[PDB]
């Protein structure tokens, strides 16, 4: 049953392209990154100064694709680290 029932495509998270992700450098301010990429949709609400960028697509009759970035900032608003999960494990 679960193999033929129609399901609409589900989108989640921020929209990313390498053309813009490749522009981010350590040393940029939070305003410079938010401008280049857009407002983050996720962050650590428990006191850590970090942003989470999640690109998730679950088309119909298809598996799920997801790519993420994590941006770590210090107490001054300076980006200190970048993580990247190009594909789900």
């Amino acid at each position: 049953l679960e193999r033929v029932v129609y399901r609409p495509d589900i989108n989640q998270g921020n929209y990313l392209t390498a053309n813009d992700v490749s522009k981010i450098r350590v040393g940029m301010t939070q305003q410079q990154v938010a401008y280049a990429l857009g407002t983050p949709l996720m962050s650590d609400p428990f006191g850590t100064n970090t942003w989470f960028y999640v690109f998730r697509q679950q088309p119909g009759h298809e598996g799920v694709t997801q790519q993420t970035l994590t941006l770590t900032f210090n107490s001054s608003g300076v980006l200190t680290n970048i993580d990247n999960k190009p594909a789900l494990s």
Binding site: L1, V4, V5, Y6, R7, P8, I10, N11, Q12, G13, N14, Y15, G38, T39, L41
Partner: protein, 502 residues
């Protein structure tokens, strides 16, 4: 020549070019809510937008899940204008609301995020009633029922219908859940019992349905019916049927009985792309249904029907509309048996052909000269007994047939004569109705002095005026029709009305 800020979408604009709204609509398919276009042409897509949250107003009775599950735009994802626009059509096809208003609002804390808001006003959904009657001739009579499309605002469609009296008792219970699974799989069924004093029957059915596309869905299921007949007045068609099954009713003797237990399989196919649930202006609907017997059952047969309707506007304001309505159907036997007579198709009445008394269109009963009895003076059909005739008796008692086709054309017009608080609930039309019901396996050679019920060309026709009003107590339809083509045995009824919720 296209200039300005084209954010990686230059081919799309050249393609639409070889406009004033198509560039905006195109960018609206992506997260560009407020682009600018000037004019060869210079555009600015602006920033990509996301949906921060979706909230609703005005759903005081319906469960929130009922509306949220109908959206195609998800929270925490980029905006599209088509993804949002489909929400209006999806909610309208439910038939639960007076209107769907929508908006987009900017988030004061950032230029790139919006809120999407849907605002509706809930409408009356179904009704409960009952009634009584007593007296020296009426004895005791009671009927009651309830039916709703949205039970307590929970999305379930339910109903109870039944009655008690001195000659016939019955009840039916039905329930269905349009959403059993989160993906839209629906389940439901019904139980019924009907003992009419002699035709006693009862049964049940259960079906499953599920969507296969945005506009299409399938249904299938199982059911069972028991049929117990007695005191059947001799008829040629009835005995033909009985003989086909190995029965041998005594000649001119109503002291008889027969019963079966039959299990069947149900199926259907539905297409629905309508704009509105009450007074649609566009789209079409196709409802193809049928059932077949399961080997091992007492009867062997199949039945298929098709109901269609199309609305086409002929103006810009969607006020002048042409509506075509058609229905076809056919059933037959398997294994050498005839289709049971109680499944015959009928037509006539507000649901089919206007201006005729219900279930009068088509072949009529032909009676045998039943044994003379104490009912011959004034208690029976004179020629249907030996007291009145010695040969096959003709009648106007419609019994229906094995195939039919009904069609009409209705020209739908506004009636801007009453205040809006009424006018928005009233629409009228000019109509032309026609239809035909006919049999198969009719031995017109054996019955050369009697009508040949195999000729389908005897099409019945009528036309008239009808008004539909979405009363707060349930839609009603009133009409008057004048027949034009009628055949011997027909009966007219020009002033008719009924419940408008079909």
């Amino acid at each position: 020549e296209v200039s300005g800020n084209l954010a990686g979408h230059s081919a799309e604009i050249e393609q639409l070019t070889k406009m004033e709204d198509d560039i905006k609509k195109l960018l609206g398919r992506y997260g560009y809510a407020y682009p600018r276009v000037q004019s060869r042409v210079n555009v600015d897509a602006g920033n990509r937008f996301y949906v921060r949250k979706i909230r609703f107003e005005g759903n005081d009775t319906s469960k929130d899940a009922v509306l949220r599950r109908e959206m195609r735009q998800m929270e925490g994802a980029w905006l599209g204008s088509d993804l949002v626009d489909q929400g209006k059509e999806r909610l309208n096809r439910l038939g639960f609301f007076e209107t769907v208003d929508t908006d987009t609002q900017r988030v004061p804390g950032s230029p790139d995020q919006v809120d999407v808001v849907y605002k509706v006003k809930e409408r009356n959904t179904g009704c409960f009633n009952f009634g009584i009657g007593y007296g020296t001739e009426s004895g005791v009579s009671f009927q009651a029922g309830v039916q709703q499309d949205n039970w307590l605002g929970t999305g379930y469609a339910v109903g109870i219908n039944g009655t008690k009296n001195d000659y016939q008792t019955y009840a039916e219970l039905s329930v269905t859940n349009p959403y059993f699974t989160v993906d839209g799989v629906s389940l439901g069924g019904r139980l019924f019992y009907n003992d009419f004093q002699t035709n006693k029957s009862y049964g049940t059915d259960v079906t499953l349905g599920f969507p296969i596309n945005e506009y299409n869905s399938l249904r299938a299921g199982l059911g069972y019916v028991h049929n117990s007949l007695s005191n059947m007045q001799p008829q040629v068609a009835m005995w033909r049927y009985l003989y086909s099954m190995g029965e041998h009713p005594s000649t001119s003797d109503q002291d008889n009985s027969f019963k079966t237990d039959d299990f069947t399989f149900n199926y259907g196919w539905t297409y629905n792309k309508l704009d509105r649930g009450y007074f649609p202006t566009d789209g079409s609907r196709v409802n193809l249904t049928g059932k077949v017997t399961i080997p091992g059952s007492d009867n062997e047969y199949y039945k298929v029907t098709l109901d269609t309707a199309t609305y086409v506007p002929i103006d810009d304001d969607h006020k002048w509309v042409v509506l075509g309505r058609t229905r076809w159907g056919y059933g037959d036997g398997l294994g050498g048996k005839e289709m049971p007579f109680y499944e015959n198709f009928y037509a006539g009445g507000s649901s089919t052909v206007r201006g005729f008394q219900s279930n009068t269109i088509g072949p009529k009963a032909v009676y045998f000269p039943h044994q003379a009895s104490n009912y011959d003076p004034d208690y029976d059909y004179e020629c249907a007994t030996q007291d009145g005739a010695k040969d096959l008796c003709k009648s106007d008692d419609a019994v229906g047939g094995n195939a039919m086709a009904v069609a009409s054309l209705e020209f739908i017009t506004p009636t801007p004569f009453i205040s809006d608080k009424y006018a928005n609930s009233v629409r009228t039309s000019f109509f032309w109705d026609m239809g035909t019901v006919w049999d198969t396996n009719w031995d017109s050679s054996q019955y050369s002095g009697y009508p040949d019920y195999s000729d389908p060309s005897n099409i019945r026709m009528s036309a008239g005026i009808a008004l539909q009003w979405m009363s707060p107590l349930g839609p009603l339809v009133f009409s008057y029709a004048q027949p034009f083509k009628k055949y011997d045995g027909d009966k007219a009824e020009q002033f008719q009305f009924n419940i408008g919720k079909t």
